[PDB]
Amino acid sequence: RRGALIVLEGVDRAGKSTQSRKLVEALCAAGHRAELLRFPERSTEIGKLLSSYLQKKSDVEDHSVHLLFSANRWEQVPLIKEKLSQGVTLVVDRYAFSGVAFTGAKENFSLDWCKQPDVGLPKPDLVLFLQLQLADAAKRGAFGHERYENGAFQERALRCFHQLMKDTTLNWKMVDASKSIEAVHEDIRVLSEDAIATATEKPLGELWK
Amino acid sequence: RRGALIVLEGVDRAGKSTQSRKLVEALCAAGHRAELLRFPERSTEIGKLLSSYLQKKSDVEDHSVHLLFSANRWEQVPLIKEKLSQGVTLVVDRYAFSGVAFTGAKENFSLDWCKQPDVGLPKPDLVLFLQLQLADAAKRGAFGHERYENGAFQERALRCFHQLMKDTTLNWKMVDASKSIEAVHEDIRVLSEDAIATATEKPLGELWK
Ligand SMILES: Nc1ncnc2c1ncn2[C@@H]1O[C@H](COP(=O)(O)OP(=O)(O)O)[C@@H](O)[C@H]1O
Ligand SMILES: Nc1ncnc2c1ncn2[C@@H]1O[C@H](COP(=O)(O)OP(=O)(O)O)[C@@H](O)[C@H]1O
Ligand SMILES: Cc1cn([C@H]2C[C@H](O)[C@@H](COP(=O)(O)O)O2)c(=O)[nH]c1=O
Ligand SMILES: Cc1cn([C@H]2C[C@H](O)[C@@H](COP(=O)(O)O)O2)c(=O)[nH]c1=O
Ligand SMILES: [Mg+2]
Ligand SMILES: [Mg+2]
Ligand SMILES: [Mg+2]
């Protein structure tokens, strides 16, 4: 019976990476086959160009870089489909919603244009959005030095995330990411176990189509 | 007064590269400022991944590779816009129509999906399509060893080129590429001088939007 495709999204410092790793751990301890994936996936050739751009070691024209982030996803599709088909649940730290939110926060990029490259990807069974006080999120240390890590940019991407949340065909769940690490974890684990039990029942969908 | 953006398209061996170089030469000898561009532009980091894929030194998932060909274009947009704004006419050996025709010849790729990444690019003032007997085109030596260089694939891309030709908002001109090199050249040169004279009159357009 297939695994579920579970995505964690949220603004920076909302706890996506910590909860993603802890969810895989709890799922494996509850006897599921589960694995962690992340985007961008920095180890391929595309991913290294992307990693360079984000660290500001290089600049890349905005359209091209949007397309590189989408291709980075499509190159892992064969692996995603295979693992799900084998009953492995995949927990993914960011996906195409981050792709659309971060480019669409830039001037002159329509939401529509930014979604197209990602149309057709494996459609998540569950899209968790980790909500946190952008401020009460800055009290989570301090913006890193990477591109996009500043307040104003974060605010334009959060609006984009909110447009994408009006999709009713995507199973979006909000999570209050202000609680402790263990409490966020328990909320996430329960919605994920629920999605996994239903997933083995419907075919993997296609994103935005 | 801006330069014109002139694109040459056609199936393999139709003479796109030879006519492109000869057109730039004739335009420069007639006192215009003109330069040659080609896609893919193999000297950037993206272009090297693309060059590797085409030579079959590497394989790349079909969606990702489509997106890489489009990003390769967008990374030269700043340069395209600047040169045109300075009165330099640009002669481009293949553009987004080849991008759409070659991926859309693959199974399960809609024309619509394949056009999106390229929506918004600098809109050619003149799109020359070099028509030639796919057969009478094989008498132009023999298919190279690169990807896509086979009859059946060429036939599916020619159908895609034909769908794209129903656009009425693109100034498409057919050229009979079966004649000699010098005769094709003279036909091309005259339509290009004509487009250059009108171009200095309307703003550079946006492709497919
Ligand atoms: N619920 C939480 N409460 C407090 N600190 C947290 C919480 N979740 C994560 N942290 C810490 O906040 C920082 C950002 O967490 P991280 O998982 O990297 O978030 P993201 O991937 O969303 O940026 C890290 O130091 C992490 O350990
Ligand atoms: N009109 C023409 N007639 C005959 N041979 C031609 C003609 N144009 C080009 N050639 C030759 O055909 C081959 C393919 O031409 P080329 O310009 O590389 O086409 P493309 O870029 O469309 O593949 C080359 O050997 C070229 O010199
Ligand atoms: C997956 C993805 C991430 N991003 C962003 C969000 C973050 O700023 C950055 C990577 O950050 P991270 O290490 O916090 O996950 O890249 C895009 O701009 N496009 C994309 O497709
Ligand atoms: C520009 C472009 C070319 N192509 C193709 C057409 C040719 O097979 C190949 C490059 O060939 P060339 O050296 O004959 O111009 O790449 C795509 O598949 N996508 C694209 O965006
Ligand atoms: Mg993280
Ligand atoms: Mg559309
Ligand atoms: Mg050529």
Side-chain angles (χ1 to χ4, degrees), chain A residues 2-37 39-106 108-132 134-138 140-148 150-158 160-201 203-209, chain B residues 2-37 39-106 108-132 134-138 140-148 150-158 160-201 203-209:
Chain A
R2 78 164 174 93
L5 173 66
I6 303 182
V7 171
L8 283 69
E9 285 294 5
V11 293
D12 301 358
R13 282 114 78 214
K16 293 166 310 294
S17 306
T18 298
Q19 301 296 341
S20 304
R21 291 188 298 266
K22 286 182 77 59
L23 173 57
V24 168
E25 286 179 343
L27 295 177
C28 287
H32 295 287
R33 282 174 73 193
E35 292 199 27
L36 180 62
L37 304 178
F39 293 101
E41 163 57 73
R42 298 187 188 226
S43 63
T44 63
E45 310 163 84
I46 289 160
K48 285 155 169 274
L49 302 178
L50 284 174
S51 187
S52 173
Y53 173 73
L54 293 171
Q55 286 165 71
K56 308 181 182 144
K57 304 189 180 167
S58 62
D59 214 328
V60 182
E61 189 282 338
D62 295 317
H63 301 77
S64 170
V65 83
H66 184 75
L67 301 176
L68 297 171
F69 272 116
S70 180
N72 188 235
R73 284 180 281 286
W74 276 104
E75 68 179 339
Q76 300 301 316
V77 163
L79 174 68
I80 288 162
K81 286 184 180 183
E82 190 54 37
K83 296 286 174 159
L84 307 157
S85 73
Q86 291 171 3
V88 177
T89 277
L90 304 169
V91 174
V92 182
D93 179 0
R94 298 190 193 268
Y95 198 52
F97 315 106
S98 267
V100 167
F102 280 78
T103 295
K106 287 168 189 195
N108 277 63
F109 277 86
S110 62
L111 216 83
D112 176 75
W113 188 90
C114 287
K115 287 164 40 172
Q116 305 309 308
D118 285 325
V119 166
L121 282 180
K123 183 178 180 175
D125 297 301
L126 170 70
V127 185
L128 295 147
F129 190 78
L130 273 58
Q131 303 184 115
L132 183 58
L134 308 202
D136 181 45
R140 267 165 201 193
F143 284 115
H145 49 256
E146 293 194 313
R147 220 177 282 276
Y148 304 152
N150 62 81
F153 198 96
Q154 292 290 305
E155 214 258 291
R156 293 155 76 75
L158 187 63
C160 296
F161 275 128
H162 285 297
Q163 299 316 307
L164 289 180
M165 280 162 195
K166 304 159 166 154
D167 188 320
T168 62
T169 98
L170 277 161
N171 180 22
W172 280 92
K173 294 291 171 162
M174 300 304 94
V175 173
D176 171 7
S178 53
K179 312 190 265 194
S180 68
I181 290 184
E182 282 311 327
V184 176
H185 170 66
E186 182 72 9
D187 288 352
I188 286 166
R189 187 180 72 70
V190 168
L191 291 166
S192 299
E193 284 286 359
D194 283 356
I196 291 169
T198 89
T200 58
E201 291 190 65
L204 173 66
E206 280 191 344
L207 185 62
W208 293 324
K209 58 183 294 186
Chain B
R2 78 164 174 93
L5 173 66
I6 303 182
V7 171
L8 283 69
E9 285 294 5
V11 293
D12 301 358
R13 282 114 78 214
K16 293 166 310 294
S17 306
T18 298
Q19 301 296 341
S20 304
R21 291 188 298 266
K22 286 182 77 59
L23 173 57
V24 168
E25 286 179 343
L27 295 177
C28 287
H32 295 287
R33 282 174 73 193
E35 292 199 27
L36 180 62
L37 304 178
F39 293 101
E41 163 57 73
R42 298 187 188 226
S43 63
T44 63
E45 310 163 84
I46 289 160
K48 285 155 169 274
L49 302 178
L50 284 174
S51 187
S52 173
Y53 173 73
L54 293 171
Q55 286 165 71
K56 308 181 182 144
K57 304 189 180 167
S58 62
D59 214 328
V60 182
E61 189 282 338
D62 295 317
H63 301 77
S64 170
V65 83
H66 184 75
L67 301 176
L68 297 171
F69 272 116
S70 180
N72 188 235
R73 284 180 281 286
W74 276 104
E75 68 179 339
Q76 300 301 316
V77 163
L79 174 68
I80 288 162
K81 286 184 180 183
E82 190 54 37
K83 296 286 174 159
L84 307 157
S85 73
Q86 291 171 3
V88 177
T89 277
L90 304 169
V91 174
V92 182
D93 179 0
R94 298 190 193 268
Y95 198 52
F97 315 106
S98 267
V100 167
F102 280 78
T103 295
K106 287 168 189 195
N108 277 63
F109 277 86
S110 62
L111 216 83
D112 176 75
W113 188 90
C114 287
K115 287 164 40 172
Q116 305 309 308
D118 285 325
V119 166
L121 282 180
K123 183 178 180 175
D125 297 301
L126 170 70
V127 185
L128 295 147
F129 190 78
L130 273 58
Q131 303 184 115
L132 183 58
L134 308 202
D136 181 45
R140 267 165 201 193
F143 284 115
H145 49 256
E146 293 194 313
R147 220 177 282 276
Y148 304 152
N150 62 81
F153 198 96
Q154 292 290 305
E155 214 258 291
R156 293 155 76 75
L158 187 63
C160 296
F161 275 128
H162 285 297
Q163 299 316 307
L164 289 180
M165 280 162 195
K166 304 159 166 154
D167 188 320
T168 62
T169 98
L170 277 161
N171 180 22
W172 280 92
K173 294 291 171 162
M174 300 304 94
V175 173
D176 171 7
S178 53
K179 312 190 265 194
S180 68
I181 290 184
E182 282 311 327
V184 176
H185 170 66
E186 182 72 9
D187 288 352
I188 286 166
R189 187 180 72 70
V190 168
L191 291 166
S192 299
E193 284 286 359
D194 283 356
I196 291 169
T198 89
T200 58
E201 291 190 65
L204 173 66
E206 280 191 344
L207 185 62
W208 293 324
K209 58 183 294 186

